[PDB]
Each structure stands twice: as C-alpha cells, then as structure tokens.
C-alpha cells in the first residue's frame, strides 16, 4: 500500500528500536552486536534533532516500516558539509520501494539543508545495497579492507558518495 | 643530527601546540582552521594517554621537531581494531626524514598494541605524503572528493591503509 514519508517523533521510537535491533542481531548492516534500548534511541533521535540532522520514517498502514538519517562524517570542522547516511528497512518489508523512497527523500532533505556531499558506508559484500545506491547517483570511492569486525569476522567497508 | 623518538610528556605540550597550530594555519594536513590553546592540547594528550593511544615525539638538537599519534577511526565497537594515524612535522623542518621515522615507530607501537588496521586520510594532492606512507606498506583505498573544505576550497580525501 501507500507509503507516507515523514519525520520521526518520540512515538516512533519503539518501531525504530525494533528495526535497529533486528539489523544488529541478524545482519552485517550495523557492525555492533549490542542491542540497544528505548533510552538509547531517545538520545539518538534527540541528538539528531539537536544538530539539525533529519530522521525520516516510512509509514504503511499506520506502521513504521523503515527509516533513514544522516549524521556527521568526521568530527573536524573541515568536514562540516559532509554527512554520512543510513537507511534501514524492516526485514519483513524488503523489495517494495521503501529503502529507495527513503533514500530519495533524504537526498532531497540534504540538498535543502545545503549538505555538499553524502557518504554511504556499505559492507563490501552487499551487492544489492551497492547497486541501489549507484542507481540514485552514488559513486564508488574505494574499499577499506578488514576495518570492521562482527561475529569474529573481519569486514570490508566500501565508501560511496554523492555530491550535491 | 640523528632523531630521538620517545613518548610525549606534559613538558612537550608547548612544542605540540606550536606544531599543531602551524599545521592549522599554514597547510592542508589538518582540516581545521581554528587555532587552539595550551589547555586544548593538554586535554588532547590526557585523553590519548587515558584511552591507551600512543603519542610519539621526535627530538633533534634538544628540540621537538615533530609528533605522531593514532586514535579511533570510527566511534562504533565494530571499528575498535582500526585506528587512524596522524604525523605532523615542524614547518621549518620538512623534507628531512622526520615524518617517515615517526610513521615507522608509530606502526611498531600499533603492532605491539594489537591494532589490526592503520588508516591514513591524506589530502589527495599531497603526493609526498602518499609516497611516504606507501614506503611503509600503506596501499591506496580510494578518494572521497570534495568532502573537506579549507581556505574556501573543496578538498579531496585519499584513504590509505596498512593491515598489521
Ligand atoms: Na522534511
């Protein structure tokens, strides 16, 4: 059915939590193994809202089925016009345009807020994510080999970028 | 004369400050434009020490002529075995082998401390710095274009890595 894209509120935190923890448990999309709690997600959203970094949710039949945001790429003031983005789709809702719609809307937000470069950091083995980012105009930069670890395995990070 | 490489002490802080502010003012090696004070560097050093991250200095004819350190590449637990390194040489002592000697010793400290990957982020035009890192076994990962800004210019970031 119809996808509503809007900004996240406190009311959405249970959904955001469930989606985030699912990715922590089951995937190589988040390189942490630590499940978080509601307090953690409140602080995450609060700090996003505080710094003026958007959090968008996708809502279907009254249910949040995905979310996206961007945040700082690197601390230094020299990187202030660069932001690193993340998109999460609920595992039950893959394939239907949620991730692509979220990414497209986030890109428009970034433009309005004068972000210069969006950066995606993608686990290098994830061909689907790589092509989908490519399809909205991201370009490969390069891979940092074995810079991550999860489940005792070394992970490679592919960076892509889109210049606005 | 020959260099002495050793760990930084609180006594070295005026020298560290001078080298750091020189880099801020006069180079594209640090993509901050804001000068700092002695207290800033005191907190920086204290936090390095506290967190288990080495700070090395090079001493020649009694004077500190450069320093090097490494710290977290990215905040998240997934990246705990990756560190990003920096090497600064006095503006009036460039081209004298200091940076290469510092890098070499920092690499050994990293090895000892069980770092898995060292990352260098280098302004892409700095062919000297790239060749220096390459001489120590770093390989190019790729370039993120226009991700920094300094002196009103967009700047390109080349990542290199060394797996220990
Ligand atoms: Na909006």
Coordinates of C-alpha atoms and ligand atoms in Angstrom, one line a residue:
Chain A
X1 CA 0.0 0.0 0.0
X2 CA 0.8 3.8 0.0
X3 CA 4.0 4.9 1.8
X4 CA 3.9 8.1 3.9
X5 CA 7.4 9.6 4.4
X6 CA 7.6 12.0 7.4
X7 CA 9.9 13.0 10.2
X8 CA 10.4 10.7 13.2
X9 CA 8.8 11.6 16.6
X10 CA 9.1 10.1 20.1
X11 CA 6.1 8.0 19.3
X12 CA 8.1 6.2 16.6
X13 CA 10.9 5.1 18.9
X14 CA 9.6 1.6 19.6
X15 CA 9.5 0.9 15.9
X16 CA 12.9 2.5 15.3
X17 CA 14.3 0.3 18.2
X18 CA 12.9 -2.9 16.7
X19 CA 14.2 -2.2 13.3
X20 CA 17.7 -1.2 14.6
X21 CA 17.9 -4.3 16.9
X22 CA 16.9 -6.6 14.1
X23 CA 19.8 -5.3 12.0
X24 CA 22.1 -5.6 15.0
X25 CA 21.1 -9.3 15.5
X26 CA 20.7 -10.6 12.0
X27 CA 22.8 -8.6 9.5
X28 CA 26.1 -7.1 8.6
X29 CA 24.4 -3.6 8.2
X30 CA 25.3 -2.5 11.6
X31 CA 28.8 -3.6 12.9
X32 CA 27.8 -3.6 16.5
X33 CA 26.5 -6.7 18.3
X34 CA 25.0 -4.8 21.2
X35 CA 21.2 -4.5 21.3
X36 CA 20.1 -1.0 22.4
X37 CA 17.1 0.1 24.5
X38 CA 14.5 2.9 24.3
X39 CA 16.7 5.3 26.2
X40 CA 19.5 4.9 23.7
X41 CA 17.1 5.6 20.8
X42 CA 15.6 8.6 22.6
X43 CA 19.1 10.0 22.9
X44 CA 20.0 9.2 19.3
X45 CA 16.9 11.0 18.0
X46 CA 17.4 13.9 20.4
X47 CA 21.0 14.4 19.3
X48 CA 19.9 14.2 15.6
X49 CA 17.1 16.7 16.2
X50 CA 19.6 18.9 18.3
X51 CA 22.2 19.1 15.5
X52 CA 19.5 19.6 12.7
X53 CA 20.2 16.2 11.1
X54 CA 16.9 14.7 9.8
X55 CA 15.4 11.4 10.7
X56 CA 12.7 10.2 8.2
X57 CA 10.4 7.3 8.7
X58 CA 8.3 5.4 6.2
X59 CA 4.8 4.6 7.4
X60 CA 2.5 2.0 5.8
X61 CA -1.0 1.0 7.1
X62 CA -0.1 3.1 10.2
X63 CA 3.1 1.1 10.8
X64 CA 6.6 2.4 10.6
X65 CA 8.4 0.1 8.2
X66 CA 11.7 1.8 7.7
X67 CA 13.8 4.9 8.5
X68 CA 16.7 6.9 7.3
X69 CA 19.0 9.6 8.6
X70 CA 22.4 11.2 8.1
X71 CA 24.9 12.5 10.6
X72 CA 28.5 13.6 10.8
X73 CA 31.1 12.0 8.6
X74 CA 34.1 13.1 10.6
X75 CA 34.4 15.4 13.6
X76 CA 36.7 18.1 12.3
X77 CA 35.1 21.5 11.2
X78 CA 36.6 20.9 7.7
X79 CA 34.1 18.1 7.1
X80 CA 31.0 20.1 8.2
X81 CA 29.4 20.0 4.7
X82 CA 29.8 16.2 4.5
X83 CA 27.3 13.8 6.1
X84 CA 27.1 10.0 6.3
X85 CA 23.7 8.5 5.6
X86 CA 22.0 5.3 6.7
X87 CA 18.7 3.6 5.5
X88 CA 17.0 0.8 7.4
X89 CA 14.1 -1.3 6.1
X90 CA 12.2 -3.7 8.3
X91 CA 13.2 -7.2 7.4
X92 CA 9.6 -8.1 6.7
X93 CA 9.2 -5.3 4.2
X94 CA 12.1 -5.7 1.8
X95 CA 11.8 -5.1 -2.1
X96 CA 8.8 -2.7 -2.2
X97 CA 10.4 0.6 -2.7
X98 CA 10.7 1.6 1.0
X99 CA 14.6 1.9 1.0
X100 CA 14.7 3.7 -2.3
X101 CA 11.9 6.1 -1.4
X102 CA 13.6 6.9 1.9
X103 CA 16.9 7.4 0.2
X104 CA 15.4 9.7 -2.4
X105 CA 13.7 11.8 0.2
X106 CA 16.8 12.0 2.4
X107 CA 18.8 13.2 -0.6
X108 CA 16.2 16.0 -1.1
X109 CA 16.5 17.0 2.6
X110 CA 20.2 17.1 2.4
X111 CA 20.0 19.4 -0.7
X112 CA 17.6 21.8 1.1
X113 CA 19.9 21.9 4.1
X114 CA 23.0 22.6 2.0
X115 CA 24.8 19.4 2.6
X116 CA 27.6 19.2 -0.1
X117 CA 28.5 15.5 0.0
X118 CA 26.5 12.5 1.1
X119 CA 28.7 9.4 2.1
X120 CA 27.4 5.8 2.3
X121 CA 29.5 3.2 4.0
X122 CA 28.4 -0.2 2.9
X123 CA 29.5 -3.7 3.8
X124 CA 31.5 -4.6 0.7
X125 CA 29.8 -8.0 0.1
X126 CA 26.4 -6.4 -0.2
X127 CA 25.9 -6.1 -3.9
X128 CA 22.2 -5.1 -3.7
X129 CA 22.9 -2.1 -1.5
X130 CA 25.8 -1.1 -3.7
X131 CA 23.7 -1.1 -6.9
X132 CA 20.8 0.6 -5.3
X133 CA 23.0 3.4 -4.1
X134 CA 24.5 3.6 -7.6
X135 CA 21.1 3.9 -9.1
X136 CA 20.5 7.2 -7.2
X137 CA 23.8 8.6 -8.4
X138 CA 26.3 7.4 -5.8
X139 CA 29.8 6.6 -7.0
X140 CA 32.3 4.1 -5.5
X141 CA 35.2 5.7 -3.8
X142 CA 37.2 2.7 -2.5
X143 CA 37.2 -0.2 0.0
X144 CA 38.9 -0.2 3.4
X145 CA 39.7 -3.9 3.9
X146 CA 39.1 -5.6 7.3
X147 CA 38.4 -2.3 9.1
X148 CA 35.4 -3.8 10.9
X149 CA 34.7 -6.9 12.9
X150 CA 31.4 -8.7 13.7
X151 CA 30.8 -12.3 14.8
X152 CA 34.6 -12.7 14.8
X153 CA 35.0 -12.0 11.1
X154 CA 36.9 -9.1 9.5
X155 CA 34.6 -6.9 7.4
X156 CA 35.3 -4.6 4.5
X157 CA 33.8 -1.1 4.2
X158 CA 33.1 0.3 0.8
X159 CA 32.6 4.0 0.6
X160 CA 30.3 5.7 -2.0
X161 CA 29.5 9.3 -2.4
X162 CA 27.0 11.7 -4.0
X163 CA 27.9 15.3 -4.4
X164 CA 25.0 17.7 -4.2
Chain B
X1 CA 71.7 15.2 13.5
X2 CA 70.0 11.9 14.4
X3 CA 66.4 11.8 15.8
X4 CA 65.3 10.6 19.2
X5 CA 61.8 9.1 19.1
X6 CA 60.0 8.9 22.5
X7 CA 56.6 9.3 24.1
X8 CA 55.3 12.8 24.7
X9 CA 55.2 14.2 28.2
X10 CA 53.4 17.2 29.6
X11 CA 56.7 19.1 29.1
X12 CA 56.3 18.7 25.4
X13 CA 53.0 20.4 25.2
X14 CA 54.2 23.9 24.1
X15 CA 56.0 22.2 21.2
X16 CA 53.0 20.1 20.3
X17 CA 50.8 23.2 20.4
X18 CA 53.2 25.2 18.1
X19 CA 53.4 22.4 15.5
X20 CA 49.6 21.8 15.6
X21 CA 48.7 25.5 15.2
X22 CA 51.3 25.8 12.4
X23 CA 49.6 22.9 10.5
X24 CA 46.2 24.5 11.1
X25 CA 47.3 27.9 9.8
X26 CA 49.7 27.0 7.0
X27 CA 48.8 23.6 5.5
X28 CA 46.2 21.2 4.2
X29 CA 47.3 18.5 6.7
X30 CA 44.6 19.3 9.3
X31 CA 41.2 20.3 8.0
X32 CA 40.5 22.6 11.0
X33 CA 41.0 26.3 10.6
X34 CA 40.7 27.3 14.3
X35 CA 43.7 27.9 16.4
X36 CA 43.8 26.3 19.8
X37 CA 45.5 27.0 23.2
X38 CA 47.7 25.1 25.5
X39 CA 44.8 23.8 27.6
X40 CA 43.2 22.3 24.5
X41 CA 46.3 20.2 23.8
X42 CA 46.6 19.2 27.5
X43 CA 43.1 17.7 27.3
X44 CA 44.0 16.1 24.0
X45 CA 47.1 14.4 25.4
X46 CA 45.4 13.4 28.6
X47 CA 42.7 11.7 26.7
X48 CA 45.2 9.9 24.4
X49 CA 47.0 8.6 27.4
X50 CA 43.8 7.6 29.2
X51 CA 42.5 5.7 26.2
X52 CA 45.7 3.8 25.5
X53 CA 46.7 5.6 22.4
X54 CA 50.4 6.5 21.9
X55 CA 51.7 9.9 21.3
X56 CA 55.3 10.0 19.9
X57 CA 57.6 12.9 19.6
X58 CA 60.7 13.4 17.5
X59 CA 63.6 15.3 19.2
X60 CA 66.6 16.7 17.4
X61 CA 69.4 19.0 18.8
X62 CA 67.2 19.2 22.0
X63 CA 64.1 20.4 20.2
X64 CA 60.8 18.7 19.3
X65 CA 60.6 18.7 15.5
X66 CA 57.5 16.6 15.0
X67 CA 55.0 14.3 16.6
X68 CA 52.6 11.4 15.7
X69 CA 49.7 9.7 17.1
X70 CA 46.7 7.5 16.3
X71 CA 43.1 7.3 17.6
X72 CA 39.8 5.8 16.8
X73 CA 39.0 5.5 13.1
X74 CA 35.2 5.5 13.8
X75 CA 33.4 5.6 17.2
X76 CA 31.5 2.3 16.8
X77 CA 32.5 -1.0 18.5
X78 CA 32.7 -2.6 15.1
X79 CA 35.8 -0.5 14.3
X80 CA 37.7 -1.0 17.6
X81 CA 40.7 -2.7 15.9
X82 CA 41.1 0.1 13.4
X83 CA 42.9 3.3 14.2
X84 CA 43.5 6.5 12.1
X85 CA 47.0 7.9 12.4
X86 CA 48.5 11.4 12.0
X87 CA 52.0 12.7 11.7
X88 CA 53.0 16.3 12.0
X89 CA 56.4 17.8 11.2
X90 CA 57.6 21.3 12.1
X91 CA 57.1 23.7 9.2
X92 CA 60.8 24.7 9.1
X93 CA 61.9 21.1 9.3
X94 CA 60.2 19.5 6.3
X95 CA 62.0 17.1 3.8
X96 CA 64.4 15.9 6.4
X97 CA 63.1 12.3 7.1
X98 CA 61.3 13.1 10.3
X99 CA 57.8 12.1 9.2
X100 CA 59.0 8.8 7.8
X101 CA 60.9 8.0 11.1
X102 CA 57.8 8.9 13.2
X103 CA 55.5 6.7 11.0
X104 CA 57.8 3.8 11.2
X105 CA 57.9 3.9 15.0
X106 CA 54.1 4.5 15.4
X107 CA 53.5 1.4 13.2
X108 CA 55.6 -0.7 15.6
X109 CA 53.7 0.7 18.7
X110 CA 50.4 -0.1 16.9
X111 CA 51.6 -3.7 16.1
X112 CA 52.6 -4.1 19.8
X113 CA 49.2 -2.8 20.9
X114 CA 47.4 -5.3 18.6
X115 CA 45.9 -2.7 16.2
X116 CA 44.6 -4.6 13.1
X117 CA 44.4 -1.8 10.6
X118 CA 46.0 1.6 10.4
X119 CA 44.2 4.2 8.3
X120 CA 45.7 7.4 6.8
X121 CA 43.5 10.2 5.5
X122 CA 45.6 12.3 3.2
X123 CA 44.7 15.4 1.2
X124 CA 44.7 13.8 -2.3
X125 CA 47.2 16.3 -3.9
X126 CA 49.8 15.6 -1.2
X127 CA 51.9 13.2 -3.4
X128 CA 54.8 13.4 -0.9
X129 CA 52.7 12.3 2.0
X130 CA 51.2 9.5 -0.1
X131 CA 54.7 8.3 -1.2
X132 CA 55.9 8.4 2.4
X133 CA 53.0 6.2 3.6
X134 CA 53.4 3.9 0.6
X135 CA 57.1 3.4 1.5
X136 CA 55.9 1.9 4.8
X137 CA 53.5 -0.5 3.2
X138 CA 50.3 1.5 3.1
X139 CA 48.1 0.9 0.0
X140 CA 45.5 3.3 -1.5
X141 CA 41.9 2.6 -0.8
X142 CA 40.3 5.4 -2.8
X143 CA 39.4 9.0 -2.8
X144 CA 36.3 10.9 -1.5
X145 CA 36.1 14.0 -3.5
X146 CA 35.1 17.4 -2.1
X147 CA 34.5 16.0 1.4
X148 CA 36.6 18.7 3.1
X149 CA 36.7 22.4 3.0
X150 CA 39.6 24.8 4.0
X151 CA 40.6 28.3 2.8
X152 CA 37.4 28.4 0.8
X153 CA 38.4 25.4 -1.3
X154 CA 36.8 21.9 -1.6
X155 CA 39.4 19.3 -0.8
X156 CA 39.6 15.6 -1.7
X157 CA 40.4 12.9 0.9
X158 CA 42.5 9.9 -0.1
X159 CA 42.4 6.9 2.3
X160 CA 45.3 4.5 2.6
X161 CA 45.6 1.6 4.9
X162 CA 48.1 -0.9 6.3
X163 CA 46.9 -4.3 7.8
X164 CA 49.1 -5.3 10.7
Ligands
LIG1 NA1 11.1 17.1 5.7

